[PDB]
């Protein structure tokens, strides 16, 4: 309804939204974490962990919340009746601080699938034995990237799907592969260049790769999928950098999975008629870091983006994804169980492994208003109705009469508390999805000049009315 | 627009007033329990006492059907008519006197008011025959939605600790619609004794099975439209009389550090539980809230005396008339030497109210906002009106006739399901029909002329 | 009510005879949105 | 007069120091945790 008829050409978010005259910033200072690089340290008898597995290799998701435009007001509001009009945060600019010293903590595995070196063969190697696996480590591809939007980022991975049923499933068959997209979660594992997939399922050996990735299913972001969003709300911006190069050239150790056609060579003799393993694998090697590759510690100013979405954070909500390989340093240390004896005894000493983390979030914001027609209300509810859930705004559809309400009696009880300890209604439909959280809703300064970040923005766009305290000469 | 508005906005007041009312009421029953044939489940006598609550559902006929001496002043197309309730009365004819109740086996230890010596040891089944008076109370409740009560009750405990037999059940606050026949508080609080009291002897008969309930003014008035009640009045009083003990195994011992260990007779701790004996006080002719007119102009809710769906509610409870007349019949009229074996004893109990209602007539103009706002409030209202349409279906049907002719066309007629109108039909309670009783004159009635007297403008023919 | 060996309360002691204090916080009105705030200056002024 | 009455009042507002400059200019905010190994943010007492 309303007079004209439903033409299908979308509006881009700077159509209806209006940019206010006023700006803000707040944010947390920093964060830490420690952890063991390889695996979590737990109470051995229990299943509960004393320590989680932690590394820079872990995708770190971050989700931030903002105060209500209606409840949280501001020094000059003059421009709106809350009846017909509402307000929304807009994200003009973003920072990421990283304060660690830069270095690599690497990793490896105590049993690695390996056969031989293919680089220079001075003799024909032996034949497949029983469990020749060995203890080997490797560096990883270096990577830096940043992700910003109101919907979570969406990665992808390989997986084993169900094959169409023809060949009777035989243990040891080559399993079918399938390419699967999924939401990114916290603690998730960067690719090593060995691909986003499930090793533990798809590799029965489990010894093919270092511990960290062997456990989990690594994921990789899809620009194709994500940016495809005709809203732009998944992500309206990003940057990325990565590098890799080859180091060593090896063979797999195990029974040949799928045989080589013999017509591809000429028949051998002695042990040369015995085909050594044809499965080769490269050795990824991280490269030299630099000071200038950092995509961090530097301001960005995001005005136009690829989607209709322009810098709008719907539902008081904003996301950031961060990937750094530079700070991956894992420090080693030991405490001696006996400090008496003056002779060095490896048994006296238990070496220990911990890892650092540091982070910053500092967020400019510009406030914004919406004028409401049904047309407006149509699209958004059409777009996503949940935004007309939390925010009525003030209104259900333009009648928007109240609900003959339930006003809550749960406030304290007799130890009944299923007025809910099985908690309150609605949800985050993504609440199941684990990832890290911070509330800023308390922090906002009314003027920027207090902070190092902001004044840059005052500097960047220049000062219209420069701060004047009538000090200095009069 | 959101945010409910004062009904006097869109409603307009007319120039016409009407009156109707029942002739009267007179009720008889047994106070303590209902009577039924011993083998049968059918009631021989219904249980009746003043202590029981009284609900009154009062229908009105749709005024839009009610032709006026001049109907021209409105258009039946664009508009409707809905009744406004200006003023309300409650008649009571019984002579004022107080009833009473008790129980033949009452859990009791001893008198705690004065003790010259430490008590004895609890035996088995020391319960006694003792009675007490209930708190005096008067209240009145008026509105277009059912009066909302509340009570304590047992909820589902947290599942952590395994409940052993005799453990303390957790407690819960439970709203419900108020039903007729339910019991006033005795001062023992609104809850279900049946569930939370296994002894069944902890209170006098009348309330033992039922659930005493009490109106929660907050949640009631908390309704946005006020349609639960737009008005009320309340009076009650109580004072203490006796001080007793519960007799039974102690559920939870007192921490010893709260006292000093005794010895001999003082070694055993007497029952810790005390419960009061509530007492009604002197009744008076002055505090009666009945037999006197009321005038409802402005209420707490945005609803101003608007009765939606031709429906209006009255909830009235009083203990002042609780008088229980006792009577006796003789099984043998011969002997002149009296014998207690000769007489059967019975208890019957009277009840009398009366109802007279003013009404004012009101028209509603429509727009979309109007139509929606109501439909927002309660859409069932428009159903009883003629607006909301609702195109029907129905292209074709195949009648095959005839069916009892047993060449089989299928087996067929399945659509009774919607005589159903009252959603509260599950709730049984007192009923009255005024629909016939309207009249267009306030002069011929005792009540009405006061309405004129108050607002003035006596207008009567000449003689 | 408390577990007999424990020091932790099983049930809180409650009776009408107990006094009741109520502390009531308000949020700072100097952060708080008004349909029109221009009637004052947040610099030279305050709100309580 | 206010500072006479109760000085703690001026703290909760702005107005940290007597005429119109502003600021408590040593360093302010810090957090050392997230997940649980290192001895918690609450090993130090609550200052406020």
mmCIF file of N, CA and C in Angstrom, chain A residues 71-78 80 82 415 442, chain C residues 10-11 31-38 40 42:
data_model
loop_
_atom_site.group_PDB
_atom_site.id
_atom_site.type_symbol
_atom_site.label_atom_id
_atom_site.label_comp_id
_atom_site.label_asym_id
_atom_site.label_seq_id
_atom_site.Cartn_x
_atom_site.Cartn_y
_atom_site.Cartn_z
ATOM 1 N N UNK A 71 16.894 5.839 24.072
ATOM 2 C CA UNK A 71 17.273 6.058 25.461
ATOM 3 C C UNK A 71 18.480 6.969 25.554
ATOM 4 N N UNK A 72 19.577 6.595 24.918
ATOM 5 C CA UNK A 72 20.740 7.458 24.971
ATOM 6 C C UNK A 72 20.510 8.603 24.007
ATOM 7 N N UNK A 73 20.425 9.800 24.544
ATOM 8 C CA UNK A 73 20.268 10.982 23.762
ATOM 9 C C UNK A 73 21.571 11.728 23.636
ATOM 10 N N UNK A 74 21.477 13.063 23.609
ATOM 11 C CA UNK A 74 22.626 13.867 23.214
ATOM 12 C C UNK A 74 22.384 15.371 23.356
ATOM 13 N N UNK A 75 23.438 16.196 23.341
ATOM 14 C CA UNK A 75 23.275 17.603 23.740
ATOM 15 C C UNK A 75 22.382 18.427 22.836
ATOM 16 N N UNK A 76 22.380 18.209 21.527
ATOM 17 C CA UNK A 76 21.425 18.900 20.669
ATOM 18 C C UNK A 76 20.646 17.865 19.862
ATOM 19 N N UNK A 77 19.408 17.614 20.274
ATOM 20 C CA UNK A 77 18.545 16.632 19.634
ATOM 21 C C UNK A 77 17.494 17.233 18.707
ATOM 22 N N UNK A 78 17.508 18.557 18.490
ATOM 23 C CA UNK A 78 16.286 19.330 18.253
ATOM 24 C C UNK A 78 15.435 18.745 17.143
ATOM 25 N N UNK A 80 14.070 15.891 16.080
ATOM 26 C CA UNK A 80 13.137 14.784 15.934
ATOM 27 C C UNK A 80 12.066 14.721 17.015
ATOM 28 N N UNK A 82 10.162 11.783 18.597
ATOM 29 C CA UNK A 82 10.289 10.322 18.662
ATOM 30 C C UNK A 82 9.075 9.570 18.141
ATOM 31 N N UNK A 415 12.911 -19.657 45.174
ATOM 32 C CA UNK A 415 13.590 -20.760 44.507
ATOM 33 C C UNK A 415 12.507 -21.506 43.742
ATOM 34 N N UNK A 442 28.521 2.250 27.818
ATOM 35 C CA UNK A 442 28.708 3.213 28.887
ATOM 36 C C UNK A 442 29.714 4.310 28.556
ATOM 37 N N UNK C 10 20.269 -21.720 53.662
ATOM 38 C CA UNK C 10 19.349 -22.380 52.748
ATOM 39 C C UNK C 10 18.214 -21.446 52.356
ATOM 40 N N UNK C 11 17.617 -20.774 53.334
ATOM 41 C CA UNK C 11 16.503 -19.866 53.090
ATOM 42 C C UNK C 11 16.830 -18.522 53.718
ATOM 43 N N UNK C 31 23.575 12.649 30.682
ATOM 44 C CA UNK C 31 23.741 11.779 29.528
ATOM 45 C C UNK C 31 22.456 11.552 28.743
ATOM 46 N N UNK C 32 21.314 12.056 29.207
ATOM 47 C CA UNK C 32 20.019 11.468 28.875
ATOM 48 C C UNK C 32 19.224 12.311 27.886
ATOM 49 N N UNK C 33 18.666 11.634 26.880
ATOM 50 C CA UNK C 33 17.971 12.301 25.785
ATOM 51 C C UNK C 33 16.586 12.814 26.125
ATOM 52 N N UNK C 34 16.355 14.070 25.817
ATOM 53 C CA UNK C 34 15.172 14.907 25.797
ATOM 54 C C UNK C 34 14.719 15.180 24.377
ATOM 55 N N UNK C 35 13.416 15.160 24.121
ATOM 56 C CA UNK C 35 12.943 15.589 22.798
ATOM 57 C C UNK C 35 13.545 16.909 22.352
ATOM 58 N N UNK C 36 13.771 17.833 23.285
ATOM 59 C CA UNK C 36 14.511 19.060 23.014
ATOM 60 C C UNK C 36 15.435 19.354 24.190
ATOM 61 N N UNK C 37 16.757 19.335 23.956
ATOM 62 C CA UNK C 37 17.738 19.654 24.994
ATOM 63 C C UNK C 37 18.298 21.072 24.925
ATOM 64 N N UNK C 38 17.999 21.836 23.873
ATOM 65 C CA UNK C 38 18.718 23.086 23.629
ATOM 66 C C UNK C 38 18.442 24.145 24.684
ATOM 67 N N UNK C 40 19.404 24.292 27.507
ATOM 68 C CA UNK C 40 20.549 24.486 28.380
ATOM 69 C C UNK C 40 21.841 24.269 27.620
ATOM 70 N N UNK C 42 25.392 22.273 28.230
ATOM 71 C CA UNK C 42 26.105 21.311 29.081
ATOM 72 C C UNK C 42 27.423 21.831 29.625
#
